[PDB]
Every structure is written in C-alpha cells, then in structure tokens.
Amino acid sequence: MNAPDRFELFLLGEGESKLKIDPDTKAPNAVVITFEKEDHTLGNLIRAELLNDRKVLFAAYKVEHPFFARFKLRIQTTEGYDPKDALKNACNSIINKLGALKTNFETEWNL
Amino acid sequence: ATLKYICAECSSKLSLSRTDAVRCKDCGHRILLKARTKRLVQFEAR
Amino acid sequence: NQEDSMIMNQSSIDRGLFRSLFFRSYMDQEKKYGMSITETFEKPQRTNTLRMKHGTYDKLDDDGLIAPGVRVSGEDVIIGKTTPISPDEEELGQRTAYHSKRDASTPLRSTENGIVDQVLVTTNQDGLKFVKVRVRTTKIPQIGDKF
Amino acid sequence: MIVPVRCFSCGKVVGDKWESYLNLLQEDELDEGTALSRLGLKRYCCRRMILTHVDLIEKFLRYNP
Amino acid sequence: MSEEGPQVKIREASKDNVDFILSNVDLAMANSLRRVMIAEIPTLAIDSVEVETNTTVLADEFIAHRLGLIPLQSMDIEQLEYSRDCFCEDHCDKCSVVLTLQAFGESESTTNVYSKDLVIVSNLMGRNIGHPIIQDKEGNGVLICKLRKGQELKLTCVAKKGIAKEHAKWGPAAAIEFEYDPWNKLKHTDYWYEQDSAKEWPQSKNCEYEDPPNEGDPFDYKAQADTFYMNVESVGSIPVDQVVVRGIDTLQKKVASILLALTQMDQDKV
Ligand SMILES: [Zn+2]
Ligand SMILES: [Zn+2]
Numbered sequence: 001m002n003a004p005d006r007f008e009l010f011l012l013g014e015g016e017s018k019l020k021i022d023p024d025t026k027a028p029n030a031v032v033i034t035f036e037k038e039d040h041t042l043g044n045l046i047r048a049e050l051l052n053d054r055k056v057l058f059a060a061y062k063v064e065h066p067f068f069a070r071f072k073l074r075i076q077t078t079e080g081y082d083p084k085d086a087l088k089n090a091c092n093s094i095i096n097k098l099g100a101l102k103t104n105f106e107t108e109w110n111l
Numbered sequence: 112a113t114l115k116y117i118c119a120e121c122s123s124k125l126s127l128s129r130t131d132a133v134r135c136k137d138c139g140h141r142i143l144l145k146a147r148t149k150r151l152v153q154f155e156a157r
Numbered sequence: 158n159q160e161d162s163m164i165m166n167q168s169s170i171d172r173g174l175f176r177s178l179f180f181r182s183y184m185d186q187e188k189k190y191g192m193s194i195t196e197t198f199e200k201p202q203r204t205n206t207l208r209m210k211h212g213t214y215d216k217l218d219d220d221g222l223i224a225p226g227v228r229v230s231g232e233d234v235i236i237g238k239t240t241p242i243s244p245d246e247e248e249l250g251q252r253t254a255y256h257s258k259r260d261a262s263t264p265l266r267s268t269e270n271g272i273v274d275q276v277l278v279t280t281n282q283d284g285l286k287f288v289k290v291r292v293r294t295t296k297i298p299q300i301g302d303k304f
Numbered sequence: 305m306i307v308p309v310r311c312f313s314c315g316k317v318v319g320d321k322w323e324s325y326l327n328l329l330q331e332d333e334l335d336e337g338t339a340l341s342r343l344g345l346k347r348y349c350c351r352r353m354i355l356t357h358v359d360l361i362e363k364f365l366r367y368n369p
Numbered sequence: 370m371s372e373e374g375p376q377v378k379i380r381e382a383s384k385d386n387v388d389f390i391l392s393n394v395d396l397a398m399a400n401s402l403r404r405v406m407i408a409e410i411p412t413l414a415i416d417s418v419e420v421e422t423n424t425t426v427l428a429d430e431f432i433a434h435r436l437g438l439i440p441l442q443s444m445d446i447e448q449l450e451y452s453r454d455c456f457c458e459d460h461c462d463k464c465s466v467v468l469t470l471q472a473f474g475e476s477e478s479t480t481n482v483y484s485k486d487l488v489i490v491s492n493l494m495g496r497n498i499g500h501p502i503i504q505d506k507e508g509n510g511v512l513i514c515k516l517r518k519g520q521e522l523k524l525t526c527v528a529k530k531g532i533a534k535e536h537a538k539w540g541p542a543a544a545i546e547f548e549y550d551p552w553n554k555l556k557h558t559d560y561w562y563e564q565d566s567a568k569e570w571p572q573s574k575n576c577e578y579e580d581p582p583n584e585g586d587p588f589d590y591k592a593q594a595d596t597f598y599m600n601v602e603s604v605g606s607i608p609v610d611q612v613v614v615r616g617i618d619t620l621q622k623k624v625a626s627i628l629l630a631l632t633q634m635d636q637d638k639v
C-alpha cells in the first residue's frame with residue numbers, strides 16, 4: 001500500500017548530500033551534523049571514538065525517528081579544536097584500528 | 112482453431128468458440144478452464 | 158510495543174513469517190430472455206461501446222475474459238459483459254449504430270490488486286452461459302495488521 | 305506446504321534438511337529431538353522450523369489436474 | 370583507536386563457523402562489526418522470476434518467493450556490478466546472473482524439484498558466482514517444490530547484487546553469537562532471582578576463559594568492557610572467514626565514505 005522503499009535505508013536521494021554540518025547556538029565550539037541514509041551501525045562508532053578524544057567536551061547522537069535512516073550527531077570541543085576536524089580525526093582513528101583488526105584476523109585464520 | 116479453454120477433469124483441450132456449447136466433447140462436463148496466458152509473467156522474487 | 162501494539166521482526170517477515178495468500182472470486186451470467194435483446198460476453202471498444210466504464214478493457218480476450226497469469230489491478234475490467242442499447246420504451250434493443258453495443262462489464266474491486274488465477278465458463282440449469290473468475294494476491298504483514 | 309527455505313529467525317537454510325529428516329525418523333527410527341540434533345539444528349529457533357512443520361503438499365498432490 | 374587494539378584469537382573453525390575471542394577493542398566496534406556482518410555484506414540472489422509454465426500446486430509468487438531465498442555462490446560478488454549503479458538497461462551479464470529451471474513429472478511418483486536443478490545461462494565471465502550452494506550430503510540442494518506426474522514447471526531467474534537491509538534474502542551471516550564479561554564483573558546486568566542467582570543462572574561456556582570473581586573483591590568501577598566472544602556462521606554463499614573479513618572491509622569503506630564526504634565539503638568550502 002503505502003510502505004516506503006527499502007532503497008531509502010542506505011541510498012542517497014535527490015538533493016540529499018551524505019553530510020550536513022550545522023553550527024549550534026546553545027554552546028561555543030559546538031556543531032550538529034546530519035548523516036543521511038545512515039543509522040547508528042556507523043553512528044555508534046563515531047560517538048565512541050569521539051569520547052576517546054580528550055579535547056572533546058561533548059559527543060552524542062540520536063535517531064529522531066526509525067521510519068527514516070537519519071542520524072543526528074552533536075559535537076562540542078575545547079577552544080581552537082574545530083569539531084569538524086575532531087570528527088575527521090575520529091574517522092582516521094577508527095579506520096586504522098579496523099585495518100589492524102583485518103590483518104590480525106587474516107593472520108589468525110591462516111594459522 | 113484457437114485454444115479458448117480446456118476440459119475439466121481431463122487434460123484434453125477443447126479449443127471451442129462461442130455457440131459451440133460448453134459441453135466437453137469427450138466428457139460431458141460443463142466447466143471449461145481458460146488456460147494460462149501465453150504472456151510471460153514477471154514476479155519480483157524480493 | 159506500547160499498548161497492544163507489537164514490534165515484529167522485519168527480517169523474519171522478509172523470509173516469510175505470517176505471509177498469506179488471498180483469493181477473491183467474481184462472476185456474471187449470460188442473459189435473461191431474448192425479447193428483442195440478448196446479453197453476452199465480448200471485448201468492448203471505446204468508440205464502439207455505449208456507457209463504457211472509466212477503466213480498461215485492453216487486457217480482455219475476444220470473449221471479454223482474461224487468461225490466468227495476467228496481472229489485473231484496481232479498476233481494470235475482468236469480465237467484458239455486454240448488453241445492447243436500451244433507449245426505447247420496452248427496454249430492449251434498438252436500431253442504432255456505434256452506441257448499439259452498450260456494455261455491462263465487471264471489473265475488480267477498486268482496492269484489489271493481483272493476478273488472474275482461474276477462469277471458469279459454464280452454464281446454469283437454464284442453459285445460460287456463466288463466467289466465474291478467481292484472482293489472487295499475496296498479503297505481507299504490515300504495521301496495521303492484527304495478530 | 306513444502307519446507308520454508310531458511311529459518312524465519314536466522315536465515316539458516318533448512319530447506320535441504322526435510323528429506324533427510326524424515327529418513328532419520330523412518331530409516332534410522334530416531335527420536336525427533338535427536339534427529340534435529342543430527343541435522344545440526346542447535347538453536348531452538350531453527351529446530352521449530354522442522355519440528356512443527358506440516359507437510360501439506362503431499363495431500364495437495366493427491367488431486368489430479 | 371590506533372591499530373594496537375583488536376587481538377583476534379580463534380578457538381574453533383570450520384566451513385561455516387568461526388569462534389572468536391576479540392580482545393582489546395571498543396564495545397561499540399565489537400557491536401558495529403556484529404551489525405555490519407548481519408546486514409551490510411553484498412551477496413548474489415534471485416531477485417526476479419519469469420513464469421513461463423506452472424501447472425503445479427504452488428502459486429506462481431509462492432515459488433518465486435522460495436527461489437529468492439536460495440543461496441547462490443557469491444565468492445566473487447565484488448566483481449559483479451551493483452544493479453543500482455549499472456548504466457546498462459534492464460540487466461546484463463556485467464550486473465546479473467541468469468538461471469533457469471525446467472521440470473516435468475516424468476515419473477508416476479512424486480518428482481522433487483531441487484535447487485541443484487537450476488542451470489546458469491548467462492556468461493559468468495570466469496567469475497565464481499551464481500552456483501546454487503549445495504551442502505546436502507546427498508547432493509540434493511534445497512527442495513524447491515514437489516511435482517505430480519502430469520505437472521510442469523518452467524522458470525527463468527535473474528539474480529542480482531544486494532544487502533540484507535534491502536531484504537533478508539541477501540544476508541549471509543545466518544547467526545552470530547556474541548557475549549562479553551562471562552562473569553558479571555562489570556555489573557552490566559542485575560540477575561533476576563527467586564533465591565540464589567548464583568545457582569539459578571547457568572554458567573556460560575565462556576566462563577572457562579576468565580578467572581572467577583572473588584567475594585573479597587571490591588567493585589572495579591574503573592574496568593571497561595573488553596574481550597568479546599563471538600561465533601559467526603554462514604549460509605554458504607560466502608566462506609565464513611570472508612563473511613568476517615568483508616564485514617570489516619565494509620566498515621572501513623563506510624567510515625572512509627563519510628571521511629570522504631568531510632573532505633568533499635572541505636574542498637567545496639573556502
Ligand atoms: Zn475431456
Ligand atoms: Zn533459527
């Protein structure tokens with residue numbers, strides 16, 4: 001009847017960029033980022049790594065509604081540490097750890 | 112001439128047209144099955 | 158799952174949990190008494206039919222019927238029953254041309270949507286041709302379905 | 305009406321176990337529980353897929369069309 | 370998170386099982402990995418069925434549904450063009466696999482139609498995909514349907530590339546066991562009991578891989594979640610070790626794609 005298309009769970013639509021970064025007004029050095037077509041499978045990683053960065057004052061996320069594959073991320077950092085770059089660092093960090101995960105598994109598997 | 116329908120209770124095809132009577136030539140039944148279209152039918156396996 | 162509402166596993170639904178098959182049957186009769194008017198079954202034409210419905214007849218065969226497997230949805234006509242123009246007092250036939258071929262066809266219920274399963278053509282004890290059509294469609298558990 | 309390809313809760317293919325399942329019950333004469341175990345059906349969410357299956361298709365094939 | 374983390378240890382392994390001890394990782398990653406294996410790994414499966422002949426008991430779409438759930442060799446799925454990105458009309462050998470099914474009740478006895486009876490028509494181009502996964506010791510891969518003497522079934526199938534988010538038919542994970550903190554030391558759960566929780570609750574098999582907590586111990590509030598016990602299965606379309614590796618690759622690509630997006634925006638910014 002009126003069920004949504006399952007493609008809308010991960011494929012970007014028309015006028016839908018992957019990320020949208022807005023600036024918060026409730027606090028200094030804080031931004032809110034919208035992840036389109038992306039649930040907390042990835043989102044939870046991002047928060048976790050952000051909270052391992054001692055220069056980050058706030059990192060949290062929420063999925064406003066399960067009907068839509070969207071993810072809100074709020075980041076607040078200390079003075080000078082542009083939150084956007086903080087996120088970029090978190091991504092680099094996560095990938096590096098995943099690289100090792102793969103390598104260690106492949107080795108362990110071979111043995 | 113044209114397969115319009117197939118006898119019931121018997122695989123025998125009738126191919127009878129209007130006014131030819133619904134009675135099955137080789138059974139006496141009066142059921143008549145239209146038979147699956149010649150057109151291929153696509154289903155979304157999904 | 159706040160009240161009597163529930164949370165169902167979509168992956169399970171995908172695999173086939175509580176999936177069901179729905180059938181519906183339609184039917185119609187040949188005619189009444191041939192008092193200068195008879196009724197029959199035959200594919201109608203937009204320009205050669207009077208008071209034609211606002212659906213479609215292009216899925217019908219020569220006799221106004223649809224072979225099994227054909228996908229028929231919404232207002233689509235399934236039984237091309239015809240009944241001659243009756244513009245006169247006696248409510249019978251009349252000496253007209255294009256509008257002489259007035260129809261009286263049967264379509265699917267506007268909410269239905271499936272394919273033709275089986276078509277039966279018989280006669281009653283009065284020797285009147287009788288058409289009966291069975292259609293089917295799959296019902297997949299929605300967020301408004303009751304369990 | 306034929307055995308569901310894949311367990312509803314897992315996706316574990318059980319559509320190739322029905323035939324051998326029946327053999328375990330007939331040819332070997334095993335308890336249904338041990339038969340399911342012999343099929344590798346560890347999780348009860350997969351055991352039920354066979355344990356409570358109703359083979360209706362055998363009845364449907366008794367008709368001649 | 371800087372490489373010196375994930376210590377992968379394998380306890381047991383088989384064609385469809387990898388029993389892990391993944392230590393020195395963030396719980397978020399342990400779970401994220403679990404999730405990405407469940408629903409973000411591309412596989413091959415029948416996503417379209419043409420019914421030419423069907424005089425069988427089962428409904429046309431009933432059968433089509435069943436066909437879509439049959440696991441197909443997906444070893445080289447990464448070499449198959451994702452259908453949504455395939456510029457070529459309808460479908461082609463570069464983005465789809467065509468299989469056919471032909472059966473007829475030659476015998477008076479019940480004829481069984483098996484997945485092993487599917488025949489690949491399209492050009493695989495040497496790619497290891499499309500082959501119906503048969504793990505039946507009798508060779509009779511998945512029973513599609515039963516068939517009466519006078520009945521006939523003729524189908525044409527088109528398999529495509531996809532992920533479980535689109536439909537469960539695409540998943541290869543099957544089931545993933547996942548547990549941490551065998552002994553309830555982190556107090557992430559409060560055991561329900563009617564007398565003695567130590568006796569009422571079954572001791573997990575993973576408890577043998579960690580020293581028991583002492584009653585003289587104080588709550589180690591500094592302790593974090595770590596050492597995750599996992600057991601990944603496979604439906605057979607993808608070697609269980611590839612299920613895990615490819616799951617990991619997927620996450621790297623996902624993070625990389627949002628990293629790329631960040632880069633793209635910075636490139637577009639002044
Ligand atoms: Zn006959
Ligand atoms: Zn199960």
Ligand SMILES: [Zn+2]
Nearest residue numbers: 455457460461
């Ligand atoms: Zn193509």
